[PDB]
Amino acid sequence: SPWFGMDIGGTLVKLSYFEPIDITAEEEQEEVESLKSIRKYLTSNVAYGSTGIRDVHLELKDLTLFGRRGNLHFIRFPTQDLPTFIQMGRDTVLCATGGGAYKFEKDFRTIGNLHLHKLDELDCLVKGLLYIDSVSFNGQAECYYFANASEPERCQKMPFNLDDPYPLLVVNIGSGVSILAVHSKDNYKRVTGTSLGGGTFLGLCSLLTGCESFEEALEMASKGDSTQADKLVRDIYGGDYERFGLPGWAVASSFGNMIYKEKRESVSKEDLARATLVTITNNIGSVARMCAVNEKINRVVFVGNFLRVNTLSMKLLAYALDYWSKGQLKALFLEHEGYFGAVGALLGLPNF
Amino acid sequence: SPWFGMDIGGTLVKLSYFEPIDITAEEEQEEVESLKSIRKYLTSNVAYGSTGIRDVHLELKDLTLFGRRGNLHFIRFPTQDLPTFIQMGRDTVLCATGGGAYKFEKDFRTIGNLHLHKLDELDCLVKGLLYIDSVSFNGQAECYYFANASEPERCQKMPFNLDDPYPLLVVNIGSGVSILAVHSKDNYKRVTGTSLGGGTFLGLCSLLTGCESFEEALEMASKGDSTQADKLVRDIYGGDYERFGLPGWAVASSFGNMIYKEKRESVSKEDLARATLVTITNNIGSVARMCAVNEKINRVVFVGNFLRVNTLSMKLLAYALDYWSKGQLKALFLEHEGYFGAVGALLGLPNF
Numbered sequence A, B: 001s002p003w004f005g006m007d008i009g010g011t012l013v014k015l016s017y018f019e020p021i022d023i024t025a026e027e028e029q030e031e032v033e034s035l036k037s038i039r040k041y042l043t044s045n046v047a048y049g050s051t052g053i054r055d056v057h058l059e060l061k062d063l064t065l066f067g068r069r070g071n072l073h074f075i076r077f078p079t080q081d082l083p084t085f086i087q088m089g090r091d092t093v094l095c096a097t098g099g100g101a102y103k104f105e106k107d108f109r110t111i112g113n114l115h116l117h118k119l120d121e122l123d124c125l126v127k128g129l130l131y132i133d134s135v136s137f138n139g140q141a142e143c144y145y146f147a148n149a150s151e152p153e154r155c156q157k158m159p160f161n162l163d164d165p166y167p168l169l170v171v172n173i174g175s176g177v178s179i180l181a182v183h184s185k186d187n188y189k190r191v192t193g194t195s196l197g198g199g200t201f202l203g204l205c206s207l208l209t210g211c212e213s214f215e216e217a218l219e220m221a222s223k224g225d226s227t228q229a230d231k232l233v234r235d236i237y238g239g240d241y242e243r244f245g246l247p248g249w250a251v252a253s254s255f256g257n258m259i260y261k262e263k264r265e266s267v268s269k270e271d272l273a274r275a276t277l278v279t280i281t282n283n284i285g286s287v288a289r290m291c292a293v294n295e296k297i298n299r300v301v302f303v304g305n306f307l308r309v310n311t312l313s314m315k316l317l318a319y320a321l322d323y324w325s326k327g328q329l330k331a332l333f334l335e336h337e338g339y340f341g342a343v344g345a346l347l348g349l350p351n352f
C-alpha cells in the first residue's frame, strides 16, 4: 500500500506521502493499476480537485525511509472537504493523528478492509519535528530565526542549529494554541494551551472585514495600521510609562480605540485585519514567554499553519520575544511548520 | 480645601471624596461659600451632569481619616468628559494617579494656584486596596470569593479574610490588564500585563454587535450562547481529549466557528457578545494562572471596572481558576474593585 501519514485538524488535513524512487523492474510489474494510478495522480498534479494543494517547495528528495529511497511529499486540504477525500478513496494501513482521527474514525472505516491506527498528536508532533530536523531540508537547515530582530535595516532570516534540541518549548499555533515542553526524545508534556489562535484570527477577521480566505485576511492586514483600532500606552500616558519600562508604542488595550463611535466609523477593514493579527500574535508571544520562564526553557519554536505565508506574524513574534524578554528568549521557526504531525504519524507505520 | 483622590484612567476617571461629618459651629462659619457649594452639590446629587455617577452603595460611613470623621464617597465619569470637569473647576491640592495624571497635567494646571501631585499607579493601587480591606466595608468583609464555584446549585458569594494578605497576586482589569505581585506593604512589583482587557471587550463587542454601552454589551452577552461562535474541543475530537485532560466543553478556538460563512450568517449579536466576554475573561484567567504559578502565589485578587456589575465574568473566573488549577488557586474579588487607585491617591495627601 502507499505510505501516508495524516494529521486531521480542526481546520486543515495535512498529508505526508512517501513516493518510492527505487522501484525495480519486477516491482513495477507487481504493482496493481490502482496503486500506479494513485502515484501518478499525486506526483503529476499540484492541485487536487478544487481545494487540495501539494506544497512542492517543501518536498524532501532522495530520503531513505524504512529501507527504501524516495521523495517525501506534503499535501493539505480543508477538513471540511474530508468527505470528498473519503469518497474518492471508496471509488491500506492509515496512520492518522489530530482530533479528526477520532471524530472521523467511523468514516475512514467505510473504506473496506482499511486499518485505521490513531496516534497521539503529541507523540506525532515531537517525533515528526525531531525527524525532519535530523534529516535536514535537502541539506539546508530546517530551523531558522530572525537575526537582529529589533533593527529592521538588519533583520534577516538565518539558520539555527538544533543538533542538541533539548530542552525546547514548542508552540503549536493551529485553530487554537498548544504549548509543549520537550525535555528529551521520550520526555515531553503539554504545558498549557490558549484558545486565541489561528481560528480566532480567521474568524474575527471574517466577521470584521468580510474576507473569505486566510490569504485575503493577510493581504488586508499588510495594508492596515493596527494603531487606528488599538489604544497604545502613549494614548493613556501621553508618552512612555517609564516607571514600568513600558514604551509609548506598546499596545495597552487591543481594539481599545473602538469604544469610541467616531473611531469605529473611520477605521478601515485593513486596519481591523491588522489589529486582529497583532492582537492574536502578541497574545501568543506573551503566553509563550510566560511558559518559557516557568519551564526554564530559553528556545521557543513556533509551528502550525497560522504562520504559513505569514511573515508579519513571524517577525512580530521574533521582535516581541526578544524585546520583552530583554534578549533572554529566542523565537525559532521551522520550514515544515504545518506538517510535523503528519510526518510523525507516517513514522509510526512500522509499529503495525 | 476638599480632600479628593483621583485616578484618571484610559476610560474612566475615579474620584474618592472624604466628606467631613464632625464640622463644628466655628468651622462652618469659616467655610467659604464655594466650598459649601461643592460639598452640598456632591452629597445632594447622585448623578452629576449627564455622565457622572456616585456609587452610593459603596460609601464608607463614619470613617476616621487624617484625624477627622467623615464619609468616604466614590464617584466615576468618563475620561472623555474630563474637559467638562476641569471647566466646572475653573468656574486645592489634587493627588492624582493613572496615566491621565501625566497626560492631562497641563490641563489641571489651568485651574489657578492648583497644586497637582502625580502619584504612582502601583503605589496607589496597593495602598488603597490594603487600606480599604483594613477599615472594612462598614463592618462587612471587603473581600469575597465564590464558594463551590464548580457546582452551580451551590455556588455562592462568601466573605474572605485578608488580615494577613501577603503574598497576593493582583489582577487589575481596566482598558488592558496589569498583574502585580504583592509580597509586603513595601515590596511589590508589576509582573506583566496583557492588552486583552476591558477595552477589548467593549471595543470588539461594539464592532460586532453595535452596542453603545458597557451595560448594553453585558445584557446582550447574558442572552447569548458563546458556543455558536467558538469551536470547542468536542467539535474537533467528537468528545473529550482524555490524553491531556481537556473536557469536550473547553474552548479550543475562540470565534473559531466563524471561519464558516454559513455559521457567520446564523450567529446572533447576543452570541457574539457572549463569545467576546468569554474569550477575554478566559484569557485573563489563564494569564493570571500562569503568573500565579511563576510567582508561587496562590491567592489571586481581581480588580478594575471590567468586573463592575459583571457577575458572568466573575463567576467564569472563579470557576475557571478553580478548575484549571485543580483547586490550587482561589479567585478573590473586592467590593470597591474600581476605586483603589483613587483611594491610594487620597491617602498621599499628608505628604504635601
Ligand SMILES: Nc1ncnc2c1ncn2[C@@H]1O[C@H](COP(=O)(O)OP(=O)(O)NP(=O)(O)O)[C@@H](O)[C@H]1O
Pocket (backbone or CB within 6 Å): A008, A009, A010, A011, A012, A013, A098, A099, A173, A174, A175, A176, A197, A198, A199, A200, A201, A202, A214, A304, A305, A306, A307, A308, A338, B236, B252
Ligand atoms: N489555506 C488555509 N485555510 C485555512 N486556514 C489557514 C490556511 N492557511 C493557513 N491557515 C491558518 O492556519 C490555521 C490552521 O492551522 P493548522 O496547524 O493546520 O491547524 P489545525 O490542525 O487544522 N487545527 P487544530 O485542531 O487546532 O490542531 C488556521 O486557523 C489559519 O489561521
Ligand SMILES: Nc1ncnc2c1ncn2[C@@H]1O[C@H](COP(=O)(O)OP(=O)(O)NP(=O)(O)O)[C@@H](O)[C@H]1O
Pocket (backbone or CB within 6 Å): A236, A252, B008, B009, B010, B011, B012, B013, B098, B099, B173, B174, B175, B176, B197, B198, B199, B200, B201, B202, B214, B304, B305, B306, B307, B308, B338
Ligand atoms: N460605565 C462604563 N463605561 C465604560 N467602561 C466601563 C463602564 N463600566 C465598566 N466598564 C468596563 O471597565 C473598563 C475600564 O476599567 P477601569 O478600571 O476604570 O480602567 P481605566 O482605569 O479607565 N483604564 P487603564 O488606563 O487601563 O488603567 C472598560 O474597559 C469596560 O470594560
Ligand SMILES: CN(c1ccc(CC(=O)N2CCN(c3ccc(Cl)nn3)CC2)cc1)S(C)(=O)=O
Pocket (backbone or CB within 6 Å): A099, A121, A175, A176, A177, A178, A192, A193, A194, A195, B233, B236, B241, B246, B250, B251, B252, B253, B282, B283, B284, B285, B286, B289, B320, B321, B324
Ligand atoms: C485543539 N487543541 C486545543 C488547543 C487549545 C485549547 C485551549 C486550552 O488548552 N485550554 C486549557 C487552558 N485554559 C484556561 C482557561 C482559563 C484558565 Cl483560568 N486557565 N486555563 C484555556 C483552555 C484546547 C485544545 S489541542 C488537541 O491541544 O492541540
Ligand SMILES: CN(c1ccc(CC(=O)N2CCN(c3ccc(Cl)nn3)CC2)cc1)S(C)(=O)=O
Pocket (backbone or CB within 6 Å): A233, A236, A241, A246, A250, A251, A252, A253, A282, A283, A284, A285, A286, A289, A320, A321, A324, B099, B121, B175, B176, B177, B178, B192, B193, B194, B195
Ligand atoms: C494601561 N496599562 C497597561 C496595561 C497593559 C499593557 C500591556 C503590557 O503590559 N504588555 C507587556 C507584555 N506584552 C508582551 C507582548 C509580547 C510578548 Cl512576547 N511579551 N509581552 C504585551 C504588552 C500595557 C500597559 S498599566 C499603566 O500597566 O495599568
Ligand SMILES: [Cl-]
Pocket (backbone or CB within 6 Å): A116, A117, A118
Ligand atoms: Cl487505533
Ligand SMILES: [Cl-]
Pocket (backbone or CB within 6 Å): B116, B117, B118
Ligand atoms: Cl507631581
Ligand SMILES: [Mg+2]
Pocket (backbone or CB within 6 Å): A009, A010, A098, A174, A175
Ligand atoms: Mg493541528
Ligand SMILES: [Mg+2]
Pocket (backbone or CB within 6 Å): B009, B010, B098, B174, B175
Ligand atoms: Mg485604571
